[PDB]
């Protein structure tokens, strides 16, 4: 059964290598979450540092692709960094060629097209990663676009990724059923981050310290990650309510 | 077993079987000995023949006026690697007016052998080499293995029954290292060393091959009646 | 490395056969039958469309019969997509010859070159062969009316009447029975349709499941005309011979 | 399947070892080196009596001072000979001199291992390269598809090789004349050949400093065959 | 390194089958139902928007795509394969036609170019076939309106009406009963919505259905005025509101 | 090189080509044949740059002979001329173009007609009743305009050709050492030995 | 199955068995460590003395990249050398274009992307080394450890080889007992001790200690080998602790 | 480019792809070559399962390489065209540089060299074709007949056959052909060639092709009636 | 425009006896009207009892001598330490010089 070793069709029309790349996604055992505010897009991810000898500042699955675009990865770090470097190069080239900053959705499509090629061409394996791109696009506003090893991509009102993704997804679904809107009706990004963390706590059922989380925030004209103290300040605000 | 089809495949215990099979070709090869003092470095090689009508396969190759090696295993692979060394020694002379350090010679061979063990299609080199030389930091002796591993030594031996000569040199270490300013005595120690690897056969005039390099001695090879002195 | 997944498309069996060529021929044997019949005053090309659906647009369709130049046409049996690759090459080759010599390409030369391309895929490159058999119908001023066939092996031969695709065994026996050398085009038209009508896997042969073409000197004085039959024209010729 | 340049567990290249089996199936070729010259002889082995045996070219000239005999898949030798000839002539052009027999052999043997995944497989033919130069005198070399070459005083290759080599072991001495060597090749060829030896199914050649490389006529070889039979009956 | 897969991954089996093409067609069978109906004064192409998640914005994912101003495409099967085909199909319309003739290619020829690309994935080294079947609807001056199907093999057929994917067998039977040669465009849109309701299971509205037409020229969608010969694109994607209007009189 | 003429008459084509091969102030040869037989009924004369002329002529010859063997059939003079023109048309935009002008005289066996084609080094082809390359044309064209008739015999064509050679020998500055004349007709190509 | 026979093939788990098999080759190798300190880094390695015939101090395993980065590795030694040769090319092209010497995090990703690239195709083999490396740049000291998969992180202390668990346990104690920081000269002495303690997992053959270090104060931000008096001082410190 | 080594050695020292190419030759229609005192004759079988053929336009079994050399073959028909084309090009190339047409030995040596190259080149399979190459050297009246085969070996033959049931016709030729006295005339040579094919063919109708080559580019193919006369004559003498 | 050639002056002289040969050359090196060196040798021992000088443009002269010296070295490696005869050396040098026929070594060479 060599149809399970390379990216060719099985008798039932399936690509097993693509399916097994999806299972590599959860190898890190980390859950991510993305939501949109009015002026911003917030992405949060669990941060697990098991080894005491590790420098915790270097342990990250959130990346600054361009000034405006941010990306979180669900999957092994080597493939994550492979995808990040390429996305950075693509976003830089786009700006040089076309004279304006690459939109989040266009980058997502481009990275998705690259992923598609690996599912069709035999010598290249799929990357075992799910890429969640976030920005505040100058045309479309707050944006969340996600890519997977199949080469599929789509925009999101909000999204979650990881082992316990389904619990987080339904938690968010039930909120948007209630609120009756496509986003978090909130002025400051600080409170959108607080919303994101609060709903992750409810869905996963775990409490978080400052070093258990990793937060990325996209605003107009810049994307930035939060420090441990920025998150701690945020955790204190949730606790006092 | 299932992981020896090519060099690009690791075994479940983390072994490269094609590299190990290439290593096996050296063990089948005829014995050759290397040893040095502080002034000179000596190669001694037991040559092998197909039969009594044939010549004895030449084991020792000159790389430069100050460097050369002896081989054990696939001779054509030794020719490729020796030719590469000749070019690298020569590049150093023409471009930098500088005799290639014996240590760099080893580093270059290591890196050349390594590339063959990580790529599809190619194969590892099937030969082991003993490089001797005299450079700006005195006399040297290297042992090259086609896994890529190069090792600097006072003395050593490779080939079939090389363990006999290697044990002898390990005992004689303190004696032969201080044979300074005396070529004939350092060779004698090498000829006595290779004798520990002999079975049924003995050292004859067209069987033995000796080479030497040193302070005021260019790399020169001795064969035929020139080695009759040492039998 | 990649050796593991190589099918080795261009090798010999122990018996001295080319696996992929033999299997490509097996594929072609399930394709809709195509018949070529060469008369003294023209050539007929007849082909059966593969199990037609009632909602298929019949008039603006081309599956079996293709035009290579004004003097040469082909009937296809096998993978249509493969055939179109080869047809465009053949069309270009014809124009190269015309550009070079200021003369229309002789039929055999075009056939040989197209067959040489197929041959290449069986001997080198490690690719699968083209799953296509052609019936070439054409005219030139050297040999006049000519029928050829080529197959995935790249081997070509000349014919007076020939079939490719499905039920060639039965079709060839029927052609061999009723064919004769002094035959006219209108008689060949009738033979072609009668043969298909008997060898067809369908219940009854109808206009919507057929492609038809003639290459006559039926134009005005010493010049050849290609006629790719329209649906209504096939309907009329089918009634005229008394099949429907 | 498996790689072309793969090592066996014993430390040998599969393809090189398999090509050696092909050479054993080949027709016998014998070479003997003396101080008066080097003699090369081969078994022609015509597959059918209708085949014109004089068209069987298994002994070949490389230069005036170097000859060559072959055994195995003889079609593979054509590109080896072509290379040898070009190497010999090219060296003469660059250096205004004859090329050493060893240097020629070494150049041919450099092709041997230029196979893999360069050509697709090793050569299926062994060569006996005989010649003379001013430095090392009369020389005989056995060039294999492994890229290895040995110098020999005498050597047999092909189907009757191991039997013929054992015979050459006893018969060869350092004071053989050219005439003695000629008869010795004929003697040993007749022993290992299937069909009965004559001038049409066996060919002799030699290389001498004075006259260079010469393939013998069927008339000349026939007299040596007749001279050989008489000498064996004479005791 | 380097692409060492220079050999075909699709080969003939002893029975004469091309395995990878058959398996690609199996992947198309699993895919969501899409359809196309040809009218006298237009063509309609339609499909269900299968949402991967309710949090996902299905507007951002376009199953129906404009190739040229007068040609549109829809598919059934693997979305990513479709997306790259649309990119290549749009580019080939320019490189191999518009940059040569100064006008857009006719439907049949663009279809032919797409078919060529899909055929090459069936024969070229180190690639699998595309896992999609396309339905390409279009208009051009000399051929009028047309509708084509393109399969993984690279084969293409012209249709009066057809369906592909999940419930294509039932959908084709439905279309046979309803289709006639006198259908007006609005009647074809009506039948398209009826046919599609059979295959769709969950919600059936303008947000879960994607539908586009090839009809009259749209000067309002052109973007400029002043050139009389340029009259606007015949391809138009029906809005979520426009679909719901027709679902009331269903 | 220098003088090459061609005259198409009723039933044949006649090619006249000068015999001189000059280099510097020395006539190296006075018996040079500036022509090649491309096929049994097709002859090509040539003139131009040294080396290029023969190299081109022989290259064309080889290609036409190759075609003849492959198809077991003789290419028409029109077809050969079109092939030659295209080769020159490629050449003119090459790194180093063939500086060769040619006349192609042939007898079409299917049409039963003689044909004369004039092609220059640029790839400029023309079918003509009479043709010339180089400075020769400046004398012969006007002469032939006057004396030529389309229904002439081969013998009349040779007398017409003698008239051209006489005029050239009288008014041309250089000694071209006479001409080699060849006739192309239904029976093939033959050389006139006494001219 | 057969998922482990080819590199870059995902198993049904989502694993690349060929990379995990390369890790086994790393685990088989000698012990090597890295210790981050106040204003720099310290590297140390176990050199098994196979025979008396090995020349002491003349089979150097620690390698320098540029003039400010040190690299050490465990596993297949030639594979490590190949990686360093690439690192040197990467560092040279960075300095060529951007003038400044390559930063350590920048350098870490250059190796990371290169090693990761060798898990993408079946025509190459993964690297049979875990590489501990680091140095001093404009932002201060950095220590890294890179694995066959291409995975790397920043470390306070790093260890790999046959005695990695023994070394890790000893490293974890230093991190706990010295929260404010460890000095460069201290780290050299500790490195010696940890190699000696980690030698208990490879105690058939006796060994040779090799240490190097980068430090903003002690070595002026350049990579240097610890030799002579400073080396013997570190050896004596280690000898005293085992007894 | 496709690189795979298809032709490789097996444990017993055989190159199976070359040997399987010989099986394709064994499947092919029979071809025979017989050289007389002043001529060579090439006889060829044509299988009679194919009726409704057009013999005017169907590729002939014997091909002219130059005006003085011919080539017949047994095995894959498509493969033979490639060898014939290359040989024809080399023939014209030889005339161009040497100013002399090829010798039959040289042309054979070239064709054989091409066949050999395909046995140790990557990405290609050997030619499933053996050839009989016959003709006369320029300004020479000595007949030449050569054979080639997929492996690349070539040799000269007084008479030889290849293809299916070739071992039967070779058996016939081995006892019927005298080396001391070859067929003195054209008629004798053609008759012996036709006789040898009649051991294998079936009927002597449109199954046998005969081509006669004589010195100085004198090649002609016999028609049906001309060949049928030999068939009629041989059968009447047989009934004895 | 950049001129890749220069003239370094000087002169050389070779004479052959019965059982010996001399190759002489002055030691002056110049450019234009300036002296670069009063002692810059341009007659070299190349091994195998061959002496050589390439006078004219010193950069080309040194390059040639360097290449020939290297040619002697590789002649030993490739041909079992055989002595390069003066006639063989001469032919080898022809190929070195002619190899740059279209961008010549601007030197008059004597061995
Ligand atoms: Cl893209
Ligand atoms: Mg003109």
Swiss-Prot record, chain A:
SMART domains noted in UniProt: Proteasome_A_N (SM00948)
Covalent crosslink: Glycyl lysine isopeptide (Lys-Gly) (interchain with G-Cter in ubiquitin): 222
Key words, A-Z: Acetylation, Cytoplasm, Isopeptide bond, Nucleus, Phosphoprotein, Proteasome, Ubl conjugation
Main location: cytoplasm
Protein's UniProt keywords contain Acetylation: yes
Misc: Present with 15200 molecules/cell in log phase SD medium.
Protein name per its UniProtKB record: Proteasome subunit alpha type-1
Organism of this sequence: Saccharomyces cerevisiae (strain ATCC 204508 / S288c) (Baker's yeast)
UniProtKB/Swiss-Prot annotation, chain C:
GO BP terms: proteasomal ubiquitin-independent protein catabolic process; proteasome core complex assembly; proteasome-mediated ubiquitin-dependent protein catabolic process
Pfam families: Proteasome, Proteasome_A_N
Record-listed cross-link Glycyl lysine isopeptide (Lys-Gly) (interchain with G-Cter in ubiquitin), residues: 99, 198, 230
KW Ubl conjugation (keyword) present: yes
Keyword vocabulary terms for this entry: Cytoplasm, Isopeptide bond, Nucleus, Proteasome, Ubl conjugation
Superkingdom assignment: Eukaryota
Cell compartments where the protein resides: Cytoplasm; Nucleus
Any one GO cellular component localisation term in the record: proteasome complex
Family, similarity comment: Belongs to the peptidase T1A family.
Task performed by this protein: The proteasome degrades poly-ubiquitinated proteins in the cytoplasm and in the nucleus. It is essential for the regulated turnover of proteins and for the removal of misfolded proteins. The proteasome is a multicatalytic proteinase complex that is characterized by its ability to cleave peptides with Arg, Phe, Tyr, Leu, and Glu adjacent to the leaving group at neutral or slightly basic pH. It has an ATP-dependent proteolytic activity.
Subunit text: The 26S proteasome consists of a 20S proteasome core and two 19S regulatory subunits. The 20S proteasome core is composed of 28 subunits that are arranged in four stacked rings, resulting in a barrel-shaped structure. The two end rings are each formed by seven alpha subunits, and the two central rings are each formed by seven beta subunits. The catalytic chamber with the active sites is on the inside of the barrel.
NCBIfam families given in the database record: PRK03996.1
Protein name, UniProt field: Proteasome subunit alpha type-3
Swiss-Prot record, chain H:
GO BP: proteasomal ubiquitin-independent protein catabolic process; proteasome-mediated ubiquitin-dependent protein catabolic process
Gene3D superfamilies listed in its UniProt record: Glutamine Phosphoribosylpyrophosphate, subunit 1, domain 1
Record InterPro entries: Ntn_hydrolases_N, Proteasome_alpha, Proteasome_alpha-type, Proteasome_asu_N, Proteasome_bsu_CS, Proteasome_sua/b
Keyword DNA-binding annotated: no
Additional note from the record: Present with 16800 molecules/cell in log phase SD medium.
Function: The proteasome degrades poly-ubiquitinated proteins in the cytoplasm and in the nucleus. It is essential for the regulated turnover of proteins and for the removal of misfolded proteins. The proteasome is a multicatalytic proteinase complex that is characterized by its ability to cleave peptides with Arg, Phe, Tyr, Leu, and Glu adjacent to the leaving group at neutral or slightly basic pH. It has an ATP-dependent proteolytic activity.
Family: Belongs to the peptidase T1A family.
Protein name per the record: Proteasome subunit alpha type-4
Originating species: Saccharomyces cerevisiae (strain ATCC 204508 / S288c)
UniProtKB/Swiss-Prot annotation, chain I:
Family: Belongs to the peptidase T1B family.
Oligomer status and interactors: The 26S proteasome consists of a 20S proteasome core and two 19S regulatory subunits. The 20S proteasome core is composed of 28 subunits that are arranged in four stacked rings, resulting in a barrel-shaped structure. The two end rings are each formed by seven alpha subunits, and the two central rings are each formed by seven beta subunits. The catalytic chamber with the active sites is on the inside of the barrel.
Organism from which the protein derives: Saccharomyces cerevisiae (strain ATCC 204508 / S288c)
Name this protein carries in UniProt: Proteasome subunit beta type-6
Function summary: Non-catalytic component of the proteasome which degrades poly-ubiquitinated proteins in the cytoplasm and in the nucleus. It is essential for the regulated turnover of proteins and for the removal of misfolded proteins. The proteasome is a multicatalytic proteinase complex that is characterized by its ability to cleave peptides with Arg, Phe, Tyr, Leu, and Glu adjacent to the leaving group at neutral or slightly basic pH. It has an ATP-dependent proteolytic activity.
Record localization: Cytoplasm; Nucleus
